Amino acid sequence: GPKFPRVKNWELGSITYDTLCAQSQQDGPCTPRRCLGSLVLPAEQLLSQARDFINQYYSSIKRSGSQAHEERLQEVEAEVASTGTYHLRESELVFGAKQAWRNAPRCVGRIQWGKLQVFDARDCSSAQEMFTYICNHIKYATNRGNLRSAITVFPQRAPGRGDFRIWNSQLVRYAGYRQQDGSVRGDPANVEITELCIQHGWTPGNGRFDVLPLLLQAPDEAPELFVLPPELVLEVPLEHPTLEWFAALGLRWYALPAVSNMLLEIGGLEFSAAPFSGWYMSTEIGTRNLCDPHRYNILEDVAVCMDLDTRTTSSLWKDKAAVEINLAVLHSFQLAKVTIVDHHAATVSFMKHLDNEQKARGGCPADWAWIVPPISGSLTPVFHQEMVNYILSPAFRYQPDPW
Amino acid sequence: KFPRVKNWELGSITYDTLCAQSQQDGPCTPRRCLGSLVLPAEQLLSQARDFINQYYSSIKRSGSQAHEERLQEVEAEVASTGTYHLRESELVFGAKQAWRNAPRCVGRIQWGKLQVFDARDCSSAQEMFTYICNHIKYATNRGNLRSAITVFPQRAPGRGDFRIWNSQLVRYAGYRQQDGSVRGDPANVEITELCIQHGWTPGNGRFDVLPLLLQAPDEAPELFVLPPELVLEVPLEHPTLEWFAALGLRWYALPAVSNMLLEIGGLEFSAAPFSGWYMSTEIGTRNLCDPHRYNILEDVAVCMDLDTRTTSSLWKDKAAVEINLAVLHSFQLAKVTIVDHHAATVSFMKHLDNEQKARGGCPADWAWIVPPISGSLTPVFHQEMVNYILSPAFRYQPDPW
Ligand code: HEM
Ligand code: HEM
Ligand SMILES: Cc1cc(N)nc(C[C@@H]2CNC[C@@H]2NCCNCCc2cccc(F)c2)c1
Ligand SMILES: Cc1cc(N)nc(C[C@@H]2CNC[C@@H]2NCCNCCc2cccc(F)c2)c1
Ligand SMILES: C[C@H](O)[C@H](O)[C@H]1CNc2nc(N)[nH]c(=O)c2N1
Ligand SMILES: C[C@H](O)[C@H](O)[C@H]1CNc2nc(N)[nH]c(=O)c2N1
Ligand SMILES: [Zn+2]
């Protein structure tokens, strides 16, 4: 075989070689001495990143080496020469946004990558206007439960000028209220953002599922607080298909997963606000959000209702309750006619995507620890699939909280 | 320099300083991570010196007379012969350290408790067999399982290796059928076929224990049947599901890995089988539910009368849990040592804390440490891990055929 990583599927016995990794222009955290694959967090410069991106764009429309390609390159360097930055054409932004999704190693939903609605909000000049754009995104994306993948792109970062930022990590989040006894009512993931919303004058609720308002920041201004109109935020009360008491627990989740604190980098340009959204894989809600010990932590409650023996690990009470909670999430979203995908169907699709990308680009960057679902890992085909992880650009990158 | 390591459930942070002790590169580079992939005198002398330094350090006698004179002996033997030999107590220390150092093992809380049988005076396949039988008897201990390793003679420059051809001491046959399907364990079709070719008369069951193919240097391997009385097995039944027992399922008590190489101070032990006890997910999830193994999920789901037509009924998940529960209940009933994945991962977290204090870190392979079901329900899911190769070490080796 070739001087490229060999990649094996242990269920099927099939082999591929990843040649796409040669295109990686950015170092990850691993070295020959030690693997750090499981850690959650990681003039001339701009111009070479820009050239690379324009080359990618022209290769994607099959015009590599043409005068249009050469003219665009010249236009970009003259823009940078005199202004220090450059700007993307509308179709370049569209291509770049889809490519950043395609390149995201942690996303199992990439079979959908070519179907992304790209809203261009590069004309936005105020917090109020960000709010309008965001409500529009939410309405389009939710589409009354027939969810449509989308991204809204606000103005890029500029030399010595402040950033557009959405302070919330998602467009929809539940409040976390720190109680006097030290415990938390609502989502403990969101204690800090809830605390900041109150400081900026939000009148807080007192429930387990209170939708947070948005803190939105335009360049060089304090952030401004905006409450989402409730009719815009689609939620799904959770019930179980056979266990009738489950509805009585008053659990719920929102329909729209919309990540809003990631930086979108395209050709050296940095879009510090570019919230994007798809639809849920059910285990995100049923396993992580509801059962993580540092989240809603409902496993014991549900096991008590199912009358399990919670005093001993070998009864597998945690496993049994987790399964029924995950089943409840699927059933309820299906009943409410809100788009959702189970972990079996999602991982099958990702395997198909792997085959697609092998043919199209000669590999696919994938982070095995994130792609493998948090329940039933080896019951899904991705557990048996070796994966190579590397950074490609355009990319979504985590960015530090602005506060 | 030193990697920051965070637990996302508790918010606690440590720094791994142990990784600086690594002398051997893994498969990753800054360009790409390959963490999910499954697979002369001076050089030997420095590995040997280092191991001896490790040894005298462990008994708190660094720089003592015994330490200086032992370094002399090693040097003299290598200068003269190009190799050397370990003393029994050194071998015992090195075997425990290789277990301690093994990144894919969730059972390492037990690392200091290991019975070491010195079999380096073995000169024939027949002798290998007696040693293996004794190991099995000792480790099994009527179901009260005890960790053990038996170390056969080291590799030598001149000649072929002592090798056990079987990947474990106890495996079930896999019989390829006219229709290309497999009866028994599909993971074992090749070794089954080798046994038949070396004169084994095969059974035709789903759980026929394989004979051993044992190899002394530069000889054809030899076939030995394990006396059935030595091989402890557990019939599988379910606490509430009566029909489960009638699936006729069983597994053997003793997990005993026999194809790995044990490397201690530059010396290589190509046959050095080791055994502990099972974590129940290995049997319940991987061996019985992998599609390329016994693949029983669908049969069981139908017995449970689940809706098999659609993934979103979570029929696979439901069936998998009940199979795992059956494994645990049946081992507990038969009074055979077993540990569930919640208990094992909780003890592994304790091991991590013990090692931080003892050594400043612990090499761990997240993809192998997190169990194949209910991953995020265990504490190890939320624990970042640093992977690297320390020596003494267990390592994979090519099949001898
Ligand atoms: C179409 C339906 C989609 C599904 C089912 C899906 C699925 C997932 C899942 C399960 C994760 C892991 C999330 C976690 O545990 O935190 C993830 C992460 C991610 N997804 Fe997708 N996704 C979808 C759409 C999208 C879209 C439209 C984008 C961007 C255009 C996207 C980009 C990403 C990125 C950048 C991550 C990593 C986020 C992080 O590091 O926190 N996904 N996705
Ligand atoms: C005492 C009870 C033990 C438990 C519960 C345990 C648990 C486990 C588990 C679950 C794995 C992953 C297995 C797989 O999926 O193939 C593993 C791997 C491993 N264990 Fe332990 N183990 C135990 C004893 C031992 C002992 C005594 C040794 C050596 C002296 C050992 C050395 C290893 C090694 C080298 C691996 C990686 C094997 C490979 O690469 O295939 N273990 N162990
Ligand atoms: C510290 C840090 C780093 C990082 N990369 N990330 C985070 C957000 C964490 C990751 N894990 C839980 C939480 N993120 C939860 C929100 N993720 C939904 C992803 C999703 C699903 C479907 C469609 C979409 F468009 C997006 C934190
Ligand atoms: C190709 C390859 C490489 C490698 N390093 N390894 C393998 C054996 C595979 C790994 N995964 C399934 C199968 N190994 C069989 C399971 N091994 C039992 C581990 C164990 C458990 C409890 C106590 C013990 F002492 C030992 C294959
Ligand atoms: C420590 C570990 O890397 C961390 O808990 C990861 C594991 N895999 C994950 N996978 C997904 N999809 N989402 C996550 O938040 C995590 N958390
Ligand atoms: C491709 C992937 O690395 C492979 O399926 C691994 C995943 N994790 C594992 N974990 C354990 N404990 N045992 C295994 O055999 C595997 N297989
Ligand atoms: Zn790595």
Side-chain angles (χ1 to χ4, degrees):
Chain A
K3 193 82 286 304
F4 295 102
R6 183 203 78 147
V7 184
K8 177 159 177 178
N9 181 291
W10 287 84
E11 176 188 342
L12 300 167
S14 61
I15 299 289
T16 72
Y17 292 85
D18 184 305
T19 52
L20 176 65
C21 61
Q23 296 316 294
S24 177
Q25 300 279 71
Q26 188 116 76
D27 291 341
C30 300
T31 70
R33 156 182 260 102
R34 81 292 180 280
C35 179
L36 258 23
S38 78
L39 306 209
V40 173
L41 285 186
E44 273 104 324
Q45 183 70 2
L46 211 219
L47 220 43
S48 80
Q49 270 177 288
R51 283 189 203 98
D52 173 80
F53 171 73
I54 298 297
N55 292 355
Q56 292 191 50
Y57 178 72
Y58 280 86
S59 297
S60 87
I61 60 162
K62 311 294 141 59
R63 297 288 169 276
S64 187
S66 64
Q67 80 287 260
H69 181 197
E70 315 295 301
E71 280 166 30
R72 182 69 177 127
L73 289 166
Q74 287 180 166
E75 178 172 61
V76 172
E77 39 208 32
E79 265 227 75
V80 171
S82 82
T83 80
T85 189
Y86 74 108
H87 301 272
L88 303 179
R89 295 203 204 293
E90 164 191 280
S91 67
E92 295 175 350
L93 180 64
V94 173
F95 163 76
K98 289 171 178 175
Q99 204 64 13
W101 182 12
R102 185 186 200 179
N103 289 346
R106 284 162 173 182
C107 181
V108 75
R110 287 179 280 170
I111 205 185
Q112 287 296 144
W113 75 271
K115 189 179 192 181
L116 176 65
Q117 204 59 51
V118 181
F119 299 114
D120 194 330
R122 287 178 299 156
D123 60 354
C124 194
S125 53
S126 74
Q128 177 52 69
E129 187 174 11
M130 300 175 64
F131 184 58
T132 309
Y133 271 118
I134 284 165
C135 289
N136 285 339
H137 182 128
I138 293 167
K139 293 188 271 204
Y140 182 91
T142 308
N143 182 36
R144 300 187 334 277
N146 187 9
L147 273 43
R148 295 180 289 207
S149 298
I151 184 173
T152 298
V153 181
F154 296 100
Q156 68 199 43
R157 177 185 272 83
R161 180 274 257 149
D163 293 343
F164 286 80
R165 288 297 298 263
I166 299 161
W167 280 33
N168 313 59
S169 62
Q170 296 180 40
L171 303 183
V172 191
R173 297 263 69 193
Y174 297 123
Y177 309 112
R178 175 143 295 303
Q179 303 303 288
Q180 219 200 310
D181 60 33
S183 74
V184 168
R185 187 159 177 84
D187 194 339
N190 301 325
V191 165
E192 214 183 345
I193 189 69
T194 307
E195 257 146 30
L196 288 169
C197 286
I198 302 167
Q199 271 154 205
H200 283 91
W202 181 51
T203 292
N206 78 347
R208 300 179 77 186
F209 301 101
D210 292 338
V211 177
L212 284 162
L214 276 2
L215 257 334
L216 304 183
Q217 174 170 53
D220 308 292
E221 288 183 328
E224 281 167 28
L225 194 80
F226 298 92
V227 177
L228 294 157
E231 65 271 19
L232 254 51
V233 180
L234 183 63
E235 295 173 275
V236 182
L238 304 183
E239 62 171 61
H240 187 279
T242 41
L243 303 164
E244 283 168 39
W245 47 257
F246 198 100
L249 268 11
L251 301 172
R252 57 211 271 116
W253 208 259
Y254 50 88
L256 187 79
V259 176
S260 56
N261 65 170
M262 298 201 71
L263 185 149
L264 161 67
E265 177 265 328
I266 300 165
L269 302 179
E270 304 188 303
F271 301 87
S272 66
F276 60 85
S277 75
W279 55 80
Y280 273 112
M281 176 166 82
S282 55
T283 58
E284 305 177 77
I285 304 171
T287 307
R288 308 296 317 281
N289 297 343
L290 299 179
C291 306
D292 273 1
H294 53 301
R295 299 293 296 288
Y296 279 85
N297 192 204
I298 66 157
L299 241 16
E300 193 171 297
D301 292 332
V302 173
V304 163
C305 297
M306 291 174 66
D307 231 284
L308 300 181
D309 184 1
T310 73
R311 50 98 187 320
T312 173
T313 56
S314 68
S315 70
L316 309 184
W317 64 270
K318 291 189 174 176
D319 315 75
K320 292 184 171 178
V323 166
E324 295 315 334
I325 296 160
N326 278 271
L327 186 60
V329 172
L330 279 152
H331 170 254
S332 300
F333 273 65
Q334 289 170 177
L335 193 63
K337 314 262 76 103
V338 178
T339 309
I340 192 146
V341 65
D342 73 67
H343 51 291
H344 303 298
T347 57
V348 165
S349 287
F350 182 78
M351 290 308 291
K352 177 57 182 198
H353 173 71
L354 288 177
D355 191 62
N356 292 344
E357 289 292 80
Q358 193 58 40
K359 292 182 294 190
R361 295 209 292 182
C364 176
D367 180 332
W368 188 98
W370 286 60
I371 294 295
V372 171
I375 50 173
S376 296
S378 71
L379 271 30
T380 72
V382 294
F383 178 103
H384 310 287
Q385 176 60 62
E386 287 172 351
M387 293 175 200
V388 188
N389 195 190
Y390 42 98
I391 298 164
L392 298 177
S393 172
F396 292 105
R397 319 191 315 223
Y398 183 81
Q399 64 183 331
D401 298 341
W403 61 86
Chain B
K1 209 153 277 264
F2 303 119
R4 184 162 150 301
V5 193
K6 177 166 169 174
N7 184 293
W8 289 84
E9 162 181 5
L10 302 167
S12 57
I13 278 148
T14 57
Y15 287 100
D16 189 306
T17 52
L18 192 51
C19 61
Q21 299 304 304
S22 194
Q23 300 272 253
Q24 232 268 252
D25 296 341
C28 302
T29 73
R31 149 167 278 114
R32 80 296 178 279
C33 172
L34 264 24
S36 74
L37 302 220
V38 172
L39 306 172
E42 68 289 315
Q43 299 141 36
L44 173 73
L45 197 71
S46 77
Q47 287 174 260
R49 288 200 309 263
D50 173 75
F51 171 74
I52 294 297
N53 291 344
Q54 279 193 52
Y55 180 75
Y56 281 83
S57 213
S58 82
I59 63 170
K60 326 219 63 40
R61 296 294 198 271
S62 295
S64 65
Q65 285 280 6
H67 182 205
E68 301 287 38
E69 294 145 5
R70 178 67 181 132
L71 287 170
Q72 223 86 110
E73 297 184 353
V74 174
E75 156 119 334
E77 204 171 340
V78 175
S80 286
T81 71
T83 195
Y84 74 108
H85 297 79
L86 304 164
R87 308 321 184 209
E88 196 175 4
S89 65
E90 286 163 1
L91 174 74
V92 168
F93 167 74
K96 284 166 185 176
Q97 219 54 25
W99 182 12
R100 198 194 185 170
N101 291 336
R104 293 166 164 179
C105 177
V106 72
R108 284 182 279 165
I109 201 78
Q110 292 289 146
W111 74 268
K113 186 153 185 270
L114 181 69
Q115 181 67 27
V116 178
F117 296 108
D118 179 3
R120 297 174 291 167
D121 53 323
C122 189
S123 68
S124 81
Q126 173 60 256
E127 289 181 3
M128 297 180 72
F129 183 59
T130 307
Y131 274 114
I132 282 166
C133 284
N134 289 339
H135 181 133
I136 290 165
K137 294 190 235 195
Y138 174 91
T140 297
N141 190 206
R142 284 99 102 268
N144 181 202
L145 271 52
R146 289 179 286 197
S147 304
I149 186 177
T150 294
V151 185
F152 293 104
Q154 70 207 55
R155 294 234 258 161
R159 57 102 168 115
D161 297 332
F162 289 82
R163 285 296 302 268
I164 294 147
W165 280 34
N166 306 59
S167 60
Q168 291 173 48
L169 299 187
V170 186
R171 299 255 72 194
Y172 294 127
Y175 305 117
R176 183 75 59 175
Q177 309 286 294
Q178 280 265 101
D179 20 284
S181 59
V182 185
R183 141 98 93 188
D185 188 344
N188 300 325
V189 175
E190 226 197 341
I191 187 78
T192 306
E193 258 147 23
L194 286 173
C195 292
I196 297 166
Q197 170 205 105
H198 288 84
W200 183 54
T201 295
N204 57 349
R206 200 145 40 111
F207 300 100
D208 293 335
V209 170
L210 278 167
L212 302 175
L213 279 164
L214 301 182
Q215 185 171 52
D218 301 300
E219 282 286 348
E222 277 192 65
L223 196 81
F224 300 98
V225 182
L226 290 169
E229 63 269 27
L230 287 210
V231 181
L232 189 56
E233 289 177 278
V234 183
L236 302 187
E237 61 160 70
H238 188 273
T240 59
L241 298 167
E242 24 90 359
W243 47 258
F244 199 99
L247 296 188
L249 273 18
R250 57 215 271 114
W251 207 257
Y252 51 84
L254 184 70
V257 169
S258 55
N259 62 173
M260 297 192 72
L261 183 140
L262 163 66
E263 177 274 313
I264 297 178
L267 303 179
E268 300 177 334
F269 302 87
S270 50
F274 58 87
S275 61
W277 56 80
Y278 269 116
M279 175 167 86
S280 52
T281 50
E282 302 176 88
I283 304 172
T285 310
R286 303 301 313 284
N287 298 351
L288 295 173
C289 303
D290 278 1
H292 52 301
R293 302 286 305 280
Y294 280 86
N295 194 217
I296 67 167
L297 229 27
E298 227 230 2
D299 286 351
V300 174
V302 172
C303 291
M304 293 177 61
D305 203 24
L306 304 179
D307 189 7
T308 272
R309 290 171 312 172
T310 143
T311 53
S312 63
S313 78
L314 297 193
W315 66 264
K316 296 192 178 183
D317 316 69
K318 286 189 194 176
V321 169
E322 294 314 324
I323 289 149
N324 284 79
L325 188 69
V327 171
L328 280 162
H329 161 85
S330 313
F331 272 69
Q332 284 160 359
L333 199 76
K335 302 200 153 83
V336 181
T337 310
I338 193 141
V339 60
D340 69 72
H341 51 291
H342 305 289
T345 55
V346 169
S347 83
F348 190 67
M349 295 299 305
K350 176 59 175 187
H351 177 72
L352 293 179
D353 187 72
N354 289 341
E355 294 291 79
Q356 196 60 40
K357 283 182 283 187
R359 284 214 291 191
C362 176
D365 182 334
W366 194 97
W368 279 60
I369 300 296
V370 175
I373 51 159
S374 300
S376 66
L377 278 29
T378 71
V380 292
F381 188 93
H382 313 278
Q383 179 64 62
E384 285 172 4
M385 295 178 196
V386 188
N387 197 8
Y388 44 99
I389 298 158
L390 297 179
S391 179
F394 287 106
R395 80 160 97 108
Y396 191 80
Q397 63 188 332
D399 295 3
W401 63 90

